[PDB]
Design an enzyme around this catalytic site. Structure first.
Site, PDB file in Angstrom:
ATOM      1  N   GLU A 171      31.557   2.543 -33.810  1.00  0.00           N
ATOM      2  CA  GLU A 171      30.536   2.487 -34.870  1.00  0.00           C
ATOM      3  C   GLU A 171      30.983   3.293 -36.116  1.00  0.00           C
ATOM      4  O   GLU A 171      31.460   4.417 -35.975  1.00  0.00           O
ATOM      5  CB  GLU A 171      29.233   3.054 -34.309  1.00  0.00           C
ATOM      6  CG  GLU A 171      28.042   2.890 -35.257  1.00  0.00           C
ATOM      7  CD  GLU A 171      26.679   3.195 -34.590  1.00  0.00           C
ATOM      8  OE1 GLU A 171      26.638   3.658 -33.407  1.00  0.00           O
ATOM      9  OE2 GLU A 171      25.645   2.965 -35.271  1.00  0.00           O
TER      10      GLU A 171
ATOM     11  N   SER B 285      27.378   6.914 -30.483  1.00  0.00           N
ATOM     12  CA  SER B 285      26.953   7.350 -29.161  1.00  0.00           C
ATOM     13  C   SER B 285      27.428   8.737 -28.797  1.00  0.00           C
ATOM     14  O   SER B 285      28.335   8.877 -27.981  1.00  0.00           O
ATOM     15  CB  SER B 285      27.458   6.346 -28.084  1.00  0.00           C
ATOM     16  OG  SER B 285      26.983   6.729 -26.790  1.00  0.00           O
TER      17      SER B 285
ATOM     18  N   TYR C 124      15.125   9.246 -33.950  1.00  0.00           N
ATOM     19  CA  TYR C 124      14.411  10.017 -32.938  1.00  0.00           C
ATOM     20  C   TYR C 124      15.468  10.858 -32.232  1.00  0.00           C
ATOM     21  O   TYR C 124      16.681  10.538 -32.296  1.00  0.00           O
ATOM     22  CB  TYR C 124      13.698   9.110 -31.935  1.00  0.00           C
ATOM     23  CG  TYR C 124      14.626   8.107 -31.240  1.00  0.00           C
ATOM     24  CD1 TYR C 124      15.418   8.495 -30.180  1.00  0.00           C
ATOM     25  CD2 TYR C 124      14.710   6.781 -31.657  1.00  0.00           C
ATOM     26  CE1 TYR C 124      16.267   7.581 -29.538  1.00  0.00           C
ATOM     27  CE2 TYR C 124      15.555   5.865 -31.039  1.00  0.00           C
ATOM     28  CZ  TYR C 124      16.334   6.274 -29.968  1.00  0.00           C
ATOM     29  OH  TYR C 124      17.186   5.408 -29.317  1.00  0.00           O
TER      30      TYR C 124
ATOM     31  N   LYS D  82      23.916  -3.425 -38.332  1.00  0.00           N
ATOM     32  CA  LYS D  82      23.221  -2.993 -37.128  1.00  0.00           C
ATOM     33  C   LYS D  82      21.767  -3.382 -37.319  1.00  0.00           C
ATOM     34  O   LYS D  82      21.245  -3.332 -38.424  1.00  0.00           O
ATOM     35  CB  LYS D  82      23.351  -1.481 -37.019  1.00  0.00           C
ATOM     36  CG  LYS D  82      22.620  -0.854 -35.865  1.00  0.00           C
ATOM     37  CD  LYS D  82      23.281   0.506 -35.606  1.00  0.00           C
ATOM     38  CE  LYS D  82      22.480   1.366 -34.680  1.00  0.00           C
ATOM     39  NZ  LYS D  82      23.184   2.590 -34.301  1.00  0.00           N
TER      40      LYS D  82
ATOM     41  N   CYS E   9      25.822  -0.504 -31.250  1.00  0.00           N
ATOM     42  CA  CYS E   9      25.197   0.537 -30.427  1.00  0.00           C
ATOM     43  C   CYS E   9      23.772   0.210 -29.973  1.00  0.00           C
ATOM     44  O   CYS E   9      23.565  -0.588 -29.080  1.00  0.00           O
ATOM     45  CB  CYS E   9      25.210   1.882 -31.172  1.00  0.00           C
ATOM     46  SG  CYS E   9      24.954   3.373 -30.139  1.00  0.00           S
TER      47      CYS E   9
END
Ligand code: NAD
Ligand code: NAD
Ligand code: AMP
Ligand code: AMP
Ligand code: GLU
Ligand code: GLU
Ligand code: GLU
EC number: 6.3.5.1
Lengths: 651, 660, 339
Positions: free
Chosen positions: C52, C203, C127, C121, C176
């Protein structure tokens, strides 16, 4: 309130049942169902799922098309519905039913004397050992109603059954193959509000199929932040060409709650208490899940919501759930080994990058012989080794104020060791501010850090912090000038309860040699403030609940009490000699929880607000104000304290 | 590269013109237009907007319906289009045009010999002094094409004109009343990608109307993160029932770039360089703007995008833009008074809340007689006053190592004052870690400076534990930006930092503001004045703060690349006689800086800001955001890695900024 | 015929790469990518997936919004595209790119000197340790084109890249978080014809996350009768608040084809030969998979199909695949006991 009631704490008890199939005999099947449902009722279950085509048997092929079989199925269905007037749980029973031109492979959702809905299977396998399209019609896209015992009831793939007096419990039903296609009905159902996904399965068994069922039920429960309740057919199905294993299982957000004996003799049930608050919390936090829903807005707003009142039992019915004592320390040794391996490598690789970025400064660390600094030293050493750095570029300091493990460890690893007595500097400082305390403790704690930082400027190093996550959670550190402060904290993400297991993990792997292992062992034997802040086993438990799920205090107390009140029940991770296996009363758990909410939500945040860098470790979370925990430094904890007064009994 | 080229730095030069109207005489109007457009060309403008119904005159009522008038309008339009082959800017000219059944009130977008599009006004006022619906048809919802001089060209309210060789410049056009309704065509256009919003206006003048026009052009430019270019009719329009004022103006994201004389004798232009990068940056950051677009996806994807190649001039054409020297310190005294009032009240109220929350601890502060701590002491005092706390609960310390202003200020405010000599503790520490100074060597190290800096903080913290207080930080935003502080054990650390959001350039003006208000009395004011007089006359290693505060604002607010910041700072700072200075710069303290210097300090800045200093900001105590430029909290405005190199910025300077 | 050619027997060789991240230095990242892609070329790979935000580094936060970073990303992207004229595999490289008002978190699909498509994406986690919405816009529902080095190329979540001379190989790309939501873009892509599903992942690693990635890549590959090719970020990403493990893996219809060392020192690749005939056969037989597609007909017919000619090597390049001797008798003793 009834504090011991699983239902009052947001659990819903669910069952996946495998009955005794008598093929082509719906009365017999219904009788087995009725008898299993009565058990589930007695267990206070809210939901009981049965195998695919329960009332006829899955495997009867063209016998599904015989008028007398279909007529007998209806008769039996109506008797179940009548019996269900007196049963607590929602029953989900399989049945071949006539609608319009054809028979559908359906699940009948039954409750307190009425049929709530009839849900047809969407995808009918017609390949390999499966011939379902021959006898039955696909359900995908059927809506409307179906006429069952003189009532029109909702019919279709788009149904949700929501408990009006238990909002965390919203049921969606699919059937076997439905969960195996790229876009399962259950995945749209979850986006629309379903939290408990049922699957009635026929599923003849073959080598490797049980794994396939697990893979798909487990992943569904995880990807859809949901409980997944699965029941397959067993004894009684025809063995003309196939055998059946009776597997039942209940998943929750990727975790196995329960499963039953494969190839049982006799009927089996999986019964477990699903935590609807857990699912609530996961969903409240993962905004991308709601984003997925808005992107499929048309799909997801078109669900029909059927209401029912569960009225579950209010009393103590136990808790059919494994609540681990150490949310951060898995009791299963294989799983614990894996976590340690990860935690250690996270710590190390976190530090390697800081050091690479600073072109390899010396590493300055205060070593006191305690668990945290011992472990950090080891982390530091490994990082240096992996980066081809001489261990002599690690500068370990003993800083006696007003232990032998420390020097022994340092000499054995072969880092650079040195002692600096801070007592005189402290005496000077205490005299200068006119002190006769917390001030007394803090002058020393402060001067330790002051010295290390200055040594770091002097000798071209960075100071390694060693405070662990549990100390961050409770503000058990001296803030600013003091051990709260450093250039990089490798321990920031590691709760205290995990630290001792990392150290053993390091010993057990043996990578640092027999002499180092012996000292490390000594550190463990010797080291194992909990007088004022409470036992860390309890505070680490509460931390996990708060940090991951934001559970209310009474919910945390309920969980901790089930995990901890009885030392003989549940599992202990490896390494708890039976003399260090305490149990805690409600009174204690309550007490430490008051200290916890006050310290965590109110007092301690300012210390976490200005936190040095360091890697997240646990899925439970870390306490970085730049990552997992964004909170005010100036808030009272009144409402949590009040919730405890109101909801948690005194003992 | 051409470094002095406004166009190469993302500027697009735009003009709003008011011509001489000759009512009912299109040839005459076109001739005025042609002559103004040639001026714009000479100025290197990319865009020239004219008044509503330019070619006919707005005010001619039913004469709009006369064949001969309409025919002459077409002939004149075609001559313009032909003349435009040689003109640099896109012309937006008003014209009553036949389409289908009616005449539309249109704006004709002309460029390099061709009509790019024709845009009809959407909302035709027919009330009070306006009768537009009588003669002309509404444009809202018209699409398709219109046949102009034997070509079919896009017609409709949904058009965007995008410069293919200048992507920050995407033009949308609306007409007068269009910007006055709850949902203006320009607002959808901006969500669709328009960055420069033109408005052709007729707009007879009345008491208060100029305000109304401003209110609506300014708010639109702010709400749409766009430039708004506006041109109203003037001399020559009929005064049968109305007068006209010729107002022209150019807005950018709520700021006035330019405006012209009202009621002029003769024609007037507003010409200004619009910063397309500023608009780009604002939009990149305000995600709710893109959210709005997605919510009106159908509305916004239906725009037709007409391409043209501007091919602007590559050379030095100056910069028609007022670049203030102090992005944090407004030159206009009224505005500066206002900012100070706000900065001060933010600081105070931020501290009052921390004190309330801690049930009113004593306030512990190290006062050294410098600007920052002087100011913090004042902030602390006022906070305590407003909370009805005795000033004697403020514990000020002088901490001499190896100034009189400090004790004089403390005694005058009447806080509790005390001295603690940290020299012995330092000597002991320096000797204990075996540093050369302890054995005589005059080695004035970073370790030597830091032992004292650290011990100051160490003392204050322990005093704070001892005496039930919190330690007030005093480090300012410019020091956070550059990592000019001693991290951890040191002045970087505290319990609450009231100065964290205040850049250094603003601090001196806060202090004066405090004096000027006079709230603390004549004796306090005199000491404060003394602090100013003494402290103003480490900028040897980190550079002059006027420059670093300049670069900070560009980086923190817009993320501008280094060469863009150098261009801007050079235009603001290279000439001390040009532009304005805030109040309080005696002509002896009005420096000018060369490109070489600006370049030099910018290399130091990018290296220190993007790479070195972030770790010190990463573990930052609490304290309130102050400036709209931003603050540096890792919990708010600035989330960045503590372990990154600044190579690419340094490289960008090497490649794009001339050595001098 | 060339009987020893994996390609002539319906295999397509694919790679998931983890490069060396240099945060905020796109030239450096591109150089590492270029060097790994040349290895993949030498291995006869048809596809090479990277982590990513490859060209900028995932972890740089508000530095993603700096003009100079974004400008340097474009420059580096264009050099890769130019280098790719000489490389066999399709490269899938991560990059923060400007489009309309914002930067998107994108995967650039590159091939033989051109950009085939740019895929944003869809779901941006905001969060816990993730703040992606702060700097980047969601891609779900964006279509159209994006202007990259003076060409307009397809932009959006709805893209398929189909090898014209190797029909079993139809590529879809997600990023992801995309594979973690109830209804992943990749699941619609498979119904529409995608057989190889790529995932570029950042990740950051935490206890248990590797299992989560496995659970979801494995189940996707099984539920969608597809190869799933996954690459996460490793060494070089910022450790301000997070650590990174460099995991790469390649799944095929529920089976692990390859994975790489976690927490490696240095770059790692997973390279495996995916059996496109296997996927073809599974899909030919499981009619309910086609039934699922017809039920989501609107979703699935709206994919845009970008064609490319792979022209893979015709000779013996071995077979990077574990073919068990006894299809009925698993060699692993634990698995055999279970059977
Ligand atoms: N095991 C460890 O890691 C460790 C280390 C040192 C101390 N300790 C324990 O903890 C104690 C440390 O004492 P402490 O926490 O009172 O000292 P501390 O200095 O860390 O915290 C109190 C200081 O911060 C200020 N403060 C309190 N709330 C604030 C807020 N919201 N915002 C800004 N400032 C605030 C107080 O005025 C005071 O100066 C020791 O006495 C000991 O019991 C544990
Ligand atoms: N007026 C003021 O506000 C003030 C006060 C004191 C000092 N100063 C000036 O600033 C200087 C302070 O010197 P300094 O900044 O070198 O000392 P410092 O202690 O503030 O910073 C260097 C220390 O931090 C460590 N470090 C560097 N980068 C790091 C990173 N990325 N992550 C973690 N740790 C890192 C270094 O190893 C070293 O220990 C003084 O010499 C003086 O010039 C200004
Ligand atoms: N006596 C000591 N010598 C060296 N380092 C120490 C000493 N005491 C504390 N430290 C350091 O400071 C931290 C504070 O430990 P504690 O306050 O005792 O839990 C330790 O984890 C060490 O890193
Ligand atoms: N000599 C001093 N006496 C008292 N406080 C000081 C002194 N020097 C520095 N400080 C404090 O530390 C801050 C940093 O100033 P400095 O490091 O001197 O540039 C000041 O603003 C004061 O709060
Ligand atoms: N799609 C699976 C279904 C497995 C099951 O029905 O349990 C198959 O291969 O038949
Ligand atoms: N709606 C405004 C019109 C102002 C203008 O057209 O300039 C009015 O009250 O007349
Ligand atoms: N949805 C996952 C994402 C995991 C990952 O990004 O690898 C979470 O909890 O953040």
């Amino acid at each position: 309130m009834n504090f011991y009631s699983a239902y009052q704490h947001g659990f819903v008890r669910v069952a996946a049942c495998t009955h005794h199939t008598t093929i082509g005999d719906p009365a017999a099947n219904a009788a087995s169902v009725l008898d299993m449902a009565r058990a589930c009722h007695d267990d206070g279950a809210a939901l009981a799922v049965f195998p695919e085509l329960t009332l006829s048997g899955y495997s009867i092929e063209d016998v599904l098309l015989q008028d007398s079989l279909l007529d007998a199925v209806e008769d039996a269905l109506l008797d179940l519905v009548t019996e269900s007037a007196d049963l607590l749980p929602v029953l989900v029973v399989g049945a071949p039913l006539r609608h319009r031109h054809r028979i559908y492979n359906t699940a009948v959702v039954i409750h307190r004397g009425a049929v709530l809905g009839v849900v047809p299977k969407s995808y009918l396998p017609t390949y390999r050992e499966f011939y379902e399209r021959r006898q039955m019609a696909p359900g995908d896209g059927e809506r409307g109603t179906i006429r069952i015992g003189g009532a029109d009831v909702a019919f279709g793939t788009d149904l949700l059954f929501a408990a009006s007096d238990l909002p965390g419990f919203v049921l969606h039903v699919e059937i076997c193959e439905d969960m195996f296609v790229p876009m399962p009905p259950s995945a749209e159902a979850a986006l629309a509000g379903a939290t408990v996904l049922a699957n009635l399965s026929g599923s003849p068994i073959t080598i490797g199929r049980a794994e396939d069922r697990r893979l798909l039920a487990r992943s569904a429960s995880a990807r859809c932040l949901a409980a997944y309740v699965y029941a397959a057919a067993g004894e009684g199905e025809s063995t003309t060409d196939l055998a059946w294993d009776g597997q039942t299982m209940i998943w929750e957000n990727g975790a196995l709650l329960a499963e039953s004996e494969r190839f049982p003799k006799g009927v089996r049930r999986s019964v477990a208490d699903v935590d609807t608050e857990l699912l609530r919390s996961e969903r409240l936090r993962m905004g991308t899940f709601d984003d997925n829903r808005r992107h499929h807005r048309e799909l997801t707003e078109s669900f029909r919501r059927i209401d029912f009142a569960l009225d579950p039992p209010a009393g103590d019915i136990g808790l059919l759930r494994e609540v681990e004592r150490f949310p951060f320390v898995p009791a299963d040794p294989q799983r614990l080994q894996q976590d340690c391996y990860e935690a250690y490598n996270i710590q190390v690789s976190g530090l390697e990058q800081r050091l690479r970025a600073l072109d390899y400064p010396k590493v300055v660390i205060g070593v006191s012989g305690g668990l945290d600094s011992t472990h950090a030293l080891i982390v530091a050493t490994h990082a240096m080794d992996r980066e081809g750095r001489p261990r002599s570029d690690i500068l370990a300091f003993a800083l006696p104020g007003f232990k032998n493990n420390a020097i022994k460890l340092a000499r054995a690893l072969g880092v650079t060791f040195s002692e600096i007595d801070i007592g005189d500097t402290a005496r000077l400082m205490l005299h200068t501010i006119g002190h006769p305390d917390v001030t007394f403790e803090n002058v020393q704690a402060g001067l330790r850090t002051d010295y290390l930082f200055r040594i770091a400027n002097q000798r071209g190093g960075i100071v390694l912090g060693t405070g662990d996550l549990s100390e961050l959670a409770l503000g058990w550190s001296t803030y600013g000038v003091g051990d709260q402060m450093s250039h990089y904290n490798v321990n920031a993400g590691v709760p205290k309860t995990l630290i001792q297991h990392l150290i053993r993990w390091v010993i057990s792997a043996g990578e640092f040699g027999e002499k180092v292992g012996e000292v490390l062992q000594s550190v463990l034997d010797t080291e194992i403030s909990e007088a004022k802040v409470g036992p860390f086993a309890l505070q680490d438990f509460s931390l996990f609940q708060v940090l991951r799920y934001g559970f209310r205090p009474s919910k945390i107390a309920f969980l901790a009490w089930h995990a901890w009140n009885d030392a003989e029940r549940g599992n202990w991770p490896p390494g708890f000699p039976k003399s260090e296996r305490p149990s805690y009363s409600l009174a204690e758990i309550r007490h430490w929880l008051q200290i916890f909410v006050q310290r965590f939500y109110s007092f301690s945040q300012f210390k976490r607000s200005a936190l040095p860098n360091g890697p997240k470790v646990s899925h439970g979370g870390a306490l970085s104000p730049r990552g997992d925990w964004r909170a005010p430094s100036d808030m009272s904890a009144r409402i949590w304290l009040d919730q405890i007064d109101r909801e948690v009994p005194k003992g």
